[PDB]
Amino acid sequence: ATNRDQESSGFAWWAGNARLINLSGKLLGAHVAHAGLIVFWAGAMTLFELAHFIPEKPMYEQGLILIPHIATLGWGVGPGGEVVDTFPFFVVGVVHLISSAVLGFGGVYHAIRGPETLEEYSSFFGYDWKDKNKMTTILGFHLIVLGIGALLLVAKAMFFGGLYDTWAPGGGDVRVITNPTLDPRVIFGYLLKSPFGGEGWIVSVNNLEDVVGGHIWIGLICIAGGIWHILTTPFGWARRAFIWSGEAYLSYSLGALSMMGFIATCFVWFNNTVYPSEFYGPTGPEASQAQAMTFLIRDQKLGANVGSAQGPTGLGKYLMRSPTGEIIFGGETMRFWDFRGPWLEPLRGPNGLDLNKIKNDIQPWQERRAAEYMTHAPLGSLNSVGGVATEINSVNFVSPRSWLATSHFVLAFFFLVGHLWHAGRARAAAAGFEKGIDRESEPVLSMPSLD
Amino acid sequence: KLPEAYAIFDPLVDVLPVIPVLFLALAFVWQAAVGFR
């Protein structure tokens, strides 16, 4: 047994995987076996969901997070997001679960049986963390792989049945995307938009054409960058800018994944385009707006003139103006006037919500949708008691949007912590004081006094 | 539900998603067996 104790490796058991830093074979093992764990989870979880799936009940009433992902890709669903065929979910789950055996096989092999280091075995697969060119080369391979994956999304959307479009004319349906947005002004226009209210940066993407065209851009960008990095080595400024070590690269990737996690949190909380409410339930904004809609409808049916109804505060009880004048729902949902959803947009006019359309044109399906979303607002207890914190036990419900937002905020945060930990440690270790201060050469002792 | 032919495997399918967690737990059994050296 090489290096697997603290005396030889310098690392205690609780930092055991740090023993793997310069053992590329066992480390490859660790990575492959882990990828095995991820795929295993996707598969087993998919099959569990399907086994538990009651097809006539809304997905979001059944604690599902993966099946909604498959459905968003156009698999297994028809008009209004209704489940027409459960077999594609089964396929996805099974194929993941079977693939995980393979990844697990290679992982266990490399981890305990295969060559502990790869450098003497092969100069292609072997590597030195401090070898900047090899690092950018492997980086390049993975960039090309990711680019390919993005083009697989594009392919699904354009040539293999399309994607579920909640915005599809006449109602939500699976739609083939024939004209993806290629205009770089729109695509990178998203990247240049404010993350604040009514703008919402990339989280604001509200049509599949933009999503798909964006993935065409990301695909080509990633492939081109991969080729770039296989054909180049880091410039001087980059050499002097970074720390060049395994733990450092790890720290960079941790910061990136933290950032992505926070982005995903906001995406699943606000966006109802790539996270269709048919599958994930209404957003908080969506459900609040839906409440306002619901009672506007009820009270108008009773004879209320909702445009002229003055609330207790002086503001319209049902309808008021946003700070730039748009007609918006009133009450507290005034904060959510940036909300957009297919059930609400037909009532929208040039100046915002249109009083004539509200009086005359509200369809029963809109009332149904507003009621459903209002009564499936993403509020619930940890033990999955649906509704406000004061609601009695009765409804078994916590929105998938809440599970995914909470989970990914926790993970993104701890990944930021990980980033700080490893970036700092990598800096200290590269500089040579990660284990503490040299008593005979304490830097502060050679510095002048502050006062 | 799973396709009818697979129905007999419902209980196994019920337990599968939990397996990855057991791997973390396994790391400690292993470490206990080598005395956390």
């Binding site: - | 209980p11 196994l12 337990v15 057991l22 396994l26 292993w30 067996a33 080598v34």
Partner: peptide
């Protein structure tokens, strides 16, 4: 309920079983 507990026990035991087998046969633990 009994089938579930039985699958859990077989899968749950499999790991400690691997460790035990290797410990018995002076394996590369």
């Amino acid at each position: 309920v009994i089938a579930q507990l039985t699958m859990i026990a077989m899968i749950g035991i499999a790991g400690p079983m691997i460790i035990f087998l290797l410990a018995v046969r002076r394996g590369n633990l």
